[PDB]
């Protein structure tokens, strides 16, 4: 969520706005010039990319920051969750905030920092597929109904390989064990599905 | 994207010049920095070291660049000159002080952020490839002599497909890898001879 809990103590300055579940917070192509505080509630953002796809952007919940001042070239559709109150800051009130307040400047300053560096250290699933097959049918192999890969083949690496978050190759692997796929232990890799593994892979 | 922010030029009066020869460390791993650091002449090299010692890229930092930090991040980083390069730092201080002056700049600085996150947000490769070749080379590989084999095919059209490396750049990546006698693709067959220099460069 990114919380900046000390913008609640300036809300009196910006415009307040309520919005019911379901609701539309920023409108497709709608022009945002001021900043979004997140009282209460929850909001979804997607973002909306030339040729008309949609796509997750970020969840945003209480004391988040979201909107913008000035325009950046993405499209964001944004939508309640739930009951939700905001506090909407243009620039005028946030110069106005700013003379009550110095602080608020770096508080500000400190979140979108905070932003940006979790972004950048961050900076697809059928690569794994891929990456899985190509490792059976070239060096799987078979025990009784299943092929079995001998190689110790770190989820780290895996990522790093095919290019892929950490977190997605957990999931992913969850996924094909949960399915009876492929089974991924530290020194060996199961499989026990070859048929459906493949199929999956020439997505 | 160096997400430039020329404006800040007018205000280095007030921070503290500061300038690397190519090569020289502008941030230490684990030295604490506490200031914004302005690139108005050079370029820098953002790496960071994750907590298992690992390093990668972070970004690359250019002409009117804004790099650094008043406060923690939780991003251990080691950013070094590439070029002869002149920066201004700026303290919390220091920017009171500009803000004093012109509240406009504060705006300014804003925006910058504004587009960064927008950037990043949004989209939220060589060494995929040698990484690849490295895992089967250790795992799969038989040591003949002063090289090791690995007997399976491997196509290119394979390998761009498991790291999502665009083809022409395995083409070259194949290519190069050849020429400097580090690894050949013989048909069927994959012969490294120089795993130390192909553990190196992944």
């Known amino acids: ?97 700013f003379r009550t307040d110095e602080d608020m400047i770096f508080e500000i300053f400190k979140n979108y920092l905070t932003k940006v560096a979790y972004y950048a250290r961050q900076v697809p699933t059928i690569r794994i597929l891929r990456l899985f097959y190509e490792l059976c049918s070239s060096q799987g192999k078979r025990v009784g109904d299943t092929y079995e890969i001998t190689m110790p083949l770190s989820q780290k690496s895996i990522g790093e390989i095919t290019g892929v978050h950490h977190v997605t190759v957990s999931r992913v692997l969850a996924s094909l064990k949960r399915e009876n796929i492929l089974d991924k232990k530290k020194n060996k890799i199961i499989v026990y599905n070859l048929g459906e593994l493949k199929h999956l892979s020439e997505q």
């Open 1 to 97: 969520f990114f919380p900046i809990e000390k913008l609640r103590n300036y809300t009196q300055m910006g415009l307040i706005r309520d919005f019911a579940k379901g609701s539309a917070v920023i409108m497709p192509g709608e022009e945002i010039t001021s900043m979004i505080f997140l009282v209460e509630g929850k909001i979804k953002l997607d973002i909306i990319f030339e040729d008309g796809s949609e796509k997750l952007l970020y969840y945003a919940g209480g004391n988040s920051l979201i909107g913008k001042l000035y325009p950046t070239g993405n499209n964001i559709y944004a939508t309640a969750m739930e009951p939700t109150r905001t506090c909407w800051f243009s620039e005028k009130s946030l110069r106005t905030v």
